[PDB]
A paper describes a structure:
PUF proteins, named for PUM (Pumilio) and [name] (fem-3 binding factor), are an exemplary system for understanding the divergence of RNA recognition within eukaryotic RNA-binding protein families. Eight PUM repeats are arranged in a crescent shape with the RNA bound on the concave face of the protein. Each repeat contributes a trio of amino acid residues, termed a tripartite recognition motif (TRM), that directly contact the opposing RNA base. [name] recognizes a 9-nt motif, 5´-UGURNNAUA-3´, whereas PUF-8 binds an 8-nt sequence, 5´-UGUANAUA-3´.
A crystal structure of the AS/Y variant in complex with PBE RNA was nearly identical to the SS/Y structure. We also tested the binding preferences of an [name] R5 AQ/Y variant that we identified as an in vivo substitution by genome engineering (see below). We did, however, recover multiple strains with deletion mutations and a single strain that incorporated a novel repeat R5 TRM variant - AQ/Y. This mutant strain was designated [name](lot14). Serendipitously the AQ/Y mutation preferentially binds to the PBE relative to the FBE in cells and in vitro, and a crystal structure of the [name] R5 AQ/Y variant bound to the PBE adopts a similar conformation to SS/Y and AS/Y bound to the PBE. The R5 AQ/Y variant displayed preference for A4, although not as strictly as PUF-8. The AQ/Y variant is most similar to the WT TRM, which seems to impart preference for A4. Finally, the [name] R5 AQ/Y variant demonstrates a recognition pattern qualitatively more similar to PUF-8 than [name]. In the case of changing specificity of [name] to that of PUF-8, we have demonstrated that a minimum of two amino acid changes (CQ/R to AQ/Y) can swap binding element length preference, but they do not impact curvature. We found that the edited strain expressing the [name] AQ/Y variant ([name](lot-14), glp-1(ar202) animals) displayed tumor formation in only 36% of gonads at 15°C. Thus, the [name] AQ/Y variant is capable of substituting for PUF-8 in vivo.
Numbering used by the authors: 167 to 568
The structure:
RNA sequence: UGUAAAUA
């Protein structure tokens, strides 16, 4: 409970309290971990403070290592820590240089243990984006280099610290993270994780030369391009493992979907998806990758993808069903055929550009459309029993009347 | 007919 001097006749905290009564009391730690007490502290802290009130606040909250961690790891104290940090960064007295290098020492001492903590992880992120950049970078160097970094990316709380590091720190200071993920054995465990799959995507987004990186120098673009390729080369060598994974399929989709990654989207399709379209279309998670490939492939690779589905597999020696018959009725493959039909119809309707590579590839979309149109025409009775077939039939009819 | 993130 709170200190006995701070309660009233009925055991509840007295009204009309001041900030220096508790600061002079030396009982701030009792106030910071109580809900009502910390509710009063963090509101009296947002008001105008004297230079000595800040002096007491800095020493009592971020002045001792053990007491600082005890508040950062506390459900209530972690909020008071973050506000005192902002006052330390807004008070340019003498102790400004000593206070945050001292604060950097306290978290670098307990880096991993704090990211894995549910409440201390917020002190890492807030200090990463609010401290001086020169000191926020030395914080990133405190990250482990061994198996503890794998546990940090896959942690429910610690994964956001790395996503924060990627967001507010220049790449050079966390370039080692890219290589730690780039190594084959670590790439498997992290991409296959519920939270690690999000970490990998966030790294690629910052490593992408899109509109959110036009402020970089070309020297910074070269360093980004070096880390970009290095990560892609590992991902593409393990692409089939990542494409069929529950979580890692979102990374192969993110690469193929992005126009600013078209150089690597073409390498995913050619060295992993090609010659495996029928197989990957029947996989629960890889079928989403197959859809994104059809939607975002360049028209030359799109032709080889179409021709593979239409004429890349031997028909069944007894029934005679080709890959089109198999996919149209498959529990997952039917969406891929629906993706092919939507693309072809979007092209002949003006909803999709047909000029690419200095030529109008319209005649090929019409060619692919006739193939689908006649298979749906010939199998209209068997397709009408399925939800997938009813949408293919009405799509062709809706296009007919345009 | 088919899938994903943590504080009062």
């Amino acid at each position: 409970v709170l200190p006995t001097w701070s309660l009233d006749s009925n055991g509840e905290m007295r009204s009309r309290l001041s900030l220096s009564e508790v600061l002079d009391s030396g009982d701030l730690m009792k106030f910071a971990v109580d809900k009502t007490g910390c509710q009063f502290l963090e509101k009296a802290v947002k008001g105008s403070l004297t230079s000595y009130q800040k002096f007491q606040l800095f020493e009592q909250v971020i002045g001792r290592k053990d007491d600082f961690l005890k508040l950062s790891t506390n459900i209530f104290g972690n909020y008071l820590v973050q506000s005192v940090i902002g006052i330390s960064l807004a008070t340019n007295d003498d102790g400004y240089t000593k206070r945050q290098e001292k604060l950097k020492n306290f978290i670098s001492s307990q880096m991993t243990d704090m990211c894995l903590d549910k409440f201390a992880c917020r002190v890492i992120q807030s200090s990463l984006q609010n401290m001086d950049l020169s000191l926020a970078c030395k914080l990133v160097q405190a990250l482990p280099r061994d198996a503890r970094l794998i546990a940090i990316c896959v942690d429910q709380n610690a994964n956001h610290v790395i996503q924060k590091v990627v967001a507010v720190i220049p790449l050079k200071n966390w370039e080692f993270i890219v290589d730690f993920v780039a190594t084959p054995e670590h790439l498997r465990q992290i991409c296959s994780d519920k939270y690690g799959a999000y970490v990998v995507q966030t790294i690629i987004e910052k490593l992408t030369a899109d509109s959110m990186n036009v402020d970089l120098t070309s020297a910074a673009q070269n360093l980004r391009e070096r880390a970009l390729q290095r990560l892609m080369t590992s991902v593409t060598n393990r692409c089939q493992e990542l494409a069929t994974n529950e979580y890692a399929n979102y990374i192969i989709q993110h690469i193929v979907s992005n126009d600013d990654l078209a150089v690597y989207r073409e390498c995913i399709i050619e060295k992993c998806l090609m010659r495996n379209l029928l197989s990957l279309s029947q996989e629960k998670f890889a079928s989403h990758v197959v859809e994104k490939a059809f939607l975002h492939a360049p028209l030359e690779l799109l032709a080889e993808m179409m021709d593979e589905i239409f004429d890349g597999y031997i028909p069944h020696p007894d029934t005679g069903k080709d890959a089109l018959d198999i996919m149209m009725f498959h529990q997952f493959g039917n969406y891929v055929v629906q993706c092919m039909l939507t693309i072809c119809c979007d092209a002949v309707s003006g909803r999709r550009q047909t000029k690419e590579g200095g030529y109008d590839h319209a005649i090929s979309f019409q060619d692919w459309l006739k193939k689908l149109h006649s298979r749906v025409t010939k199998e209209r009775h068997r397709l009408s029993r399925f939800s997938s077939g009813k949408k293919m039939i009405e799509t062709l009819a809706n296009l007919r009347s345009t």
